[PDB]
């Protein structure tokens, strides 16, 4: 029943376009100047949108932005003359969301992450003193504005703490609001508890209430009744400085039991009085009151691109209104038109900053369709309005019993981000208030009603019901089998009779995410290794020829149709034209449909985004049939790895501690080979001496290194570039003909491949070049990488490894039919890591190879039998043995093990080993780095860090401690001075090494001198001294800086 997987990103932009921008335009529409003579009205319900310029593909290839222009009709009304100059004003450029849920910013694909925050409303908490009683406090939190904290003291006093200032009894706040004693006495249910506070703090009247409120809020100024009134109005009553939100109003009404309208979004007297009454009742234990949990998913909200955009637009609109008022009052003449009145710079700047430089808009993860899909379904607890890494602690990063079916309990990062970034579950969705829901089937008298439609439900809703998991087994029609059924009641796990079950989850995979739903035999794995496998499935690399798994899980065809790289025919007809770049299908009786395929493009992670056709010319095609496929799909469905022959046994030390031994067939059969495209850039700037020229007249170079340039100084498409090869030839006008200097762009060390695209952008051609540049040349270089020693290989069950040896196929162990293996894995890593599912898939994959079949096993498949996975695997293996005719395929004494021989000697190993077909993936990432001498830092004169600039390795203080414990003094002193920042000892050491002499003694490193200068610059007279040798002499200050 899986709906659109990337719908949290669409619904929020469809909402922004439909009723999100309108509400923010109308909320600021009536602009009036101070004299009250001119008024600008923004008829924001009629904002039209101009069609996007360029195109999606043109924007991508030009390195531009995919956006539209917003025009709102306005009317400037003169309060007296009455002349109304109606017009349409330009408001801004809005980047548009593509059909896949992403945005195209500066020619790069970006995605707006979803933020899990605390929902607006009122939250109660009870705190216990070291020796005192329980004291209760309440926090009122709006969508945007100031917080309102209430607190109960140990003596029975009620205090209010506006913002973070000092407390003030609630009587001041209630009287300042304009409430007499009778109304606040009647609304409260237990009035003597507040009467104690009234008596202790004295009954304030409205005038003195406002006086004291002003005095406490803004000390040092003379109190003024009007001053206080205005302070309160600006703090909690100003529609443009305090917003509860629709969700805030909903939560306030739901919690406090009020009935206020949904349109009012500011605090009202009723609200504060109710909140106080609830606090009093919670203090007195009335019965219908309860403290709040802040980690509950019923008290937490999700914000997506629509809300975050709305907020940025609001800020820009506030700035725009300030500019409009400034450029409206100054004018002494009504010669202004609405076009000349509005300035779209603040709004454009706000939108640009949000989409380019915010920490909620993120560079897309595009290694494969799975990473892309799970990047759009990601929920973050960090950002402008959430948490910070140093403030998030143990409680926040854990699993809350309310995450069941809404947030995956497996898929998270490892390290500082563990528990702070999560993934939406498979069936979960976000409603229009911002709370995550999840679907259930109704159960009537123990019968599951799959005829009726799924009932979605939020975390707070499903607390009074008894909800059964999706792995419960029902008989014909719908009745639940068994006598005891596990259920969840009030965030607890219990068991009940199946006549008292209220709801049942829709699927057994309703609790996990999409990446974790792609792991077969998941219930036989540990959760840590399941996390590892799910995370590593999103680092797999699209291969040269992808291949479907044999033991897939059933969600592969659905995890690939949302990335928008598979083409399916919407029409039940015939195919008339097939090409490497074009497909055409003629409807049985109708129009022709034509599709264009992307070819060897480049993703954010330098992988390849190819697209290939599947069908042939003159082929009968049905609707919904796969027509083209992506770089990580075979025929409809995800394909991230390959199926290879695997044996579980140790080699001669090459399997040691997660190392991997593979065969040479994986190299010459083009298994686990991939295409990676990199981008290099060169800039022609304008120096004070003169401009920079791209030409082949490069100094100090021979014609043997200008073979592949295009008589303009730029390499040619289709040329093979090795390391250090010139890509674009550039000359700079240095100041000291023989005057040009060479800073042409060359391939970095360790890079090679073919040149596939050389795009040029110059201001003449109508391109948006940087401020000081006069030519931007971009070169794309592609290469094919094979599996090799040092690469990371992985499986779906969390088993990672680094390849340490590649054996010729006559050295690898072979089967009783002569087939050498493809990979040998150490079994020592299986039982200590509890990822037994890898031993099931292999075996089933073995059967799948032998029976020319493909198995779709769904996780948690043991609801049908006592041991369903083992029985299915054994039955499949026996069936394969009977169909093939070879008895060595399957043995009854050792089911999963068969005899294997040694390729080096021809002798069989002592005992049979487990062999099968395993689905392994090749992970991304270019890490090898070395340095002798290179660039140095500006202040400290220490080597730079980074592979791209010949950087050094850091010798931290733990390494200094390690060298101190060894007793090493000369290695340490050489590391600290001669090899880092002894500005004069570096050259002497290098010269001594080159000449062959001895390295001289070092001096004082430059960082110490920098520190002494900084300390002197802090008004400290710190200095270095040389002690006097004889008696009647003074110590002499030593000059280091010489």
């Amino acid at each position: 029943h899986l709906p659109d997987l990337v719908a949290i990103q669409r619904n929020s932009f469809r909402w922004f376009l439909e009723e999100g921008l309108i509400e923010e335009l109308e909320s600021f529409s009536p602009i009036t100047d101070y004299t009250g003579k001119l008024e600008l009205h923004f008829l924001g319900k009629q904002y039209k949108l101009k069609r996007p310029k360029y195109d999606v593909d043109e924007a991508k290839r030009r390195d531009g932005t995919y956006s539209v222009q917003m025009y709102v009709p306005t009317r400037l009304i003169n309060k007296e003359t009455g002349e109304i100059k109606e017009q349409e004003v330009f408001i801004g450029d809005l980047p548009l969301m593509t059909d896949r849920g992403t945005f195209i910013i500066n020619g790069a694909e970006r995605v707006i992450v979803n933020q899990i925050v605390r929902s607006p409303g009122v939250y109660y908490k009870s705190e216990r003193d070291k020796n005192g009683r329980l004291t209760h406090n309440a926090s009122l939190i709006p969508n945007r504005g100031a917080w309102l904290k209430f607190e109960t003291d140990k003596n029975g006093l009620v205090w209010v703490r506006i913002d973070k200032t000092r407390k003030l009894s609630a009587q001041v706040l209630l009287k300042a609001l304009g409430l007499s004693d009778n109304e606040i006495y009647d609304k409260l249910r237990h009035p003597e508890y507040y009467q104690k506070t009234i008596d202790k703090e004295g009954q304030f009247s409205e005038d003195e209430a406002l006086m004291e409120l002003y005095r406490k809020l803004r000390p040092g100024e003379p109190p003024t009744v009007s001053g206080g009134q205005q302070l309160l109005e600006s703090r909690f009553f100003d529609p443009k400085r305090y917003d509860l939100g629709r969700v805030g109003r909903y939560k306030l009404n739901k919690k406090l039991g009020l009935n206020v309208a949904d349109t009012v979004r500011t605090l009202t007297s009723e609200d504060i009085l109710a909140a106080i009454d609830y606090l009093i009742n919670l203090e007195l234990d009335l019965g219908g009151c309860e403290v709040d949990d802040i980690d509950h998913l019923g008290n937490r909200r999700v914000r997506s691109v629509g809300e975050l955009l709305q907020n940025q637009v609001r800020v820009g609109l506030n700035r725009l209104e300030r500019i409009i008022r400034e450029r409206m009052t100054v004018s002494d003449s009504d010669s202004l038109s609405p076009a000349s009145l509005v300035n779209p710079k603040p709004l454009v700047a706000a939108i640009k900053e949000f989409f380019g430089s915010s920490q909620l808009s993120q560079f897309m993860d595009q290694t494969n369709p799975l990473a892309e899909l799970t990047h759009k379904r990601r929920l973050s607890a960090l950002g402008p309005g959430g948490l910070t890494r140093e403030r998030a602690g143990f409680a926040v990063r854990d699993i809350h019993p309310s995450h069941y079916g809404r947030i995956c309990p497996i898929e998270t990062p490892e390290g500082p981000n563990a528990g702070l970034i999560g993934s939406l579950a498979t069936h979960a969705r976000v409603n229009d208030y911002g709370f995550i829901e999840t679907p259930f089937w109704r159960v009537e008298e123990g019968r599951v009603r799959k005829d009726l439609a799924p009932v979605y439900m939020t975390a707070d809703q499903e607390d009074d019901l008894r909800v059964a998991p999706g792995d419960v087994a029902t008989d014909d029609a719908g009745y639940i089998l068994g006598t005891t059924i596990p259920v969840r009641y009030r965030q607890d796990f219990t068991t009940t009779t199946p006549e008292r079950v209220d709801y049942v989850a829709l699927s057994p995979v309703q609790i996990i995410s999409v990446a974790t739903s792609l792991i077969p035999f998941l219930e036989h794995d540990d959760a840590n290794r399941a996390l590892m496998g799910s995370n590593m499935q999103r680092q797999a690399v699209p291969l040269l020829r992808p291949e479907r798994p044999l033991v897939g899980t059933g969600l592969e065809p659905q995890a690939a149709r949302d990335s928008g790289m598979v083409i399916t025919s919407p029409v039940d007809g015939t195919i008339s034209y097939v090409d490497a770049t074009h497909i055409e299908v003629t409807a049985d009786t109708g129009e022709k449909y034509g599709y264009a395929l992307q070819k060897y493009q480049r993703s954010n992670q330098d992988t390849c985004l190819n697209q290939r056709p599947i069908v042939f010319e003159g082929d009968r095609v049905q609707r919904g049939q796969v027509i083209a496929d992506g770089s990580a799909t075979e025929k409809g469905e995800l394909a991230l790895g390959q199926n290879i022959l695997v044996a579980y046994m140790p080699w001669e030390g090459y399997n040691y501690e997660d190392a991997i031994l593979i065969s040479e067939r994986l190299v010459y059969d083009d298994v686990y080979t991939s295409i990676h495209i990199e981008k290099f850039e060169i800039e022609a700037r304008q120096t004070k001496l003169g401009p920079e020229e791209i030409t082949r007249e490069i100094p100090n170079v021979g014609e043997d290194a200008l073979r592949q340039l295009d008589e303009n100084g730029i390499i040619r498409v289709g040329a093979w570039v090795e390391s250090g090869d010139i890509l674009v030839g550039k000359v700079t006008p240095k100041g000291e003909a023989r005057d040009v200097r060479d800073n042409s762009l060359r391939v970095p060390n360790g890079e090679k491949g073919r040149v596939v695209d050389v795009r040029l952008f110059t201001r003449e051609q109508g391109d948006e070049l940087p401020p000081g540049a006069n030519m931007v040349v971009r070169v794309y270089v592609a290469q094919k990488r094979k599996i090799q020693v040092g690469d990371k290989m992985a499986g779906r069950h969390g088993n990672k490894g680094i390849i340490s040896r590649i054996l010729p196929c006559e050295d690898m162990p072979y089967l009783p039919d002569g087939t050498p293996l493809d990979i040998v894995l150490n079994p020592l890593g299986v039982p200590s890591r509890m990822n037994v599912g890898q031993v099931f898939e292999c075996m089933l994959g073995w059967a799948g190879q032998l029976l020319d079949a493909r198995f779709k096993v769904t996780p948690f498949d043991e609801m049908y039998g006592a041991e369903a996975s083992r029985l299915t695997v054994n039955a499949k293996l026996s069936e394969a043995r009977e169909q093939t005719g070879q008895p060595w395929v399957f043995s009854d004494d050792e089911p999963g093990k068969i005899q294997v021989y040694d390729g080096r000697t021809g002798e069989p190993f002592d005992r049979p080993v487990t062999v099968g077909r395993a689905y392994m993936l090749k992970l991304v990432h270019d890490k090898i780095h070395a340095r002798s001498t290179g660039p140095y830092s500006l202040v400290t004169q220490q080597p730079l860090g980074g592979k791209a600039q010949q950087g050094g390795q850091r010798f931290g203080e733990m390494e200094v401690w390690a060298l101190e414990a060894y007793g090493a003094a000369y290695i340490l002193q050489e590391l600290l001075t001669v090899k880092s920042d002894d500005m004069q000892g570096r050259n002497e050491a290098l010269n001594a090494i080159v000449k062959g002499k001895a390295i001289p003694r070092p001096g004082t490193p430059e960082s110490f001198k920098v520190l002494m200068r900084e300390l002197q610059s802090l008004c400290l007279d710190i200095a270095v001294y040389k002690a006097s040798t004889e008696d009647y002499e003074e110590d002499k200050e030593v000059d280091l800086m010489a």
Binding site: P935, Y936, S937, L938, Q941, L944, Q949, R986, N991
Partner: peptide, 17 residues
């Protein structure tokens, strides 16, 4: 990560002396 840690220094590379 800061911008100031990605800028090289003016001087003669030990190699070029």
């Amino acid at each position: 990560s800061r911008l100031g840690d990605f800028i090289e220094a003016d001087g003669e590379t030990p190699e070029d002396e």
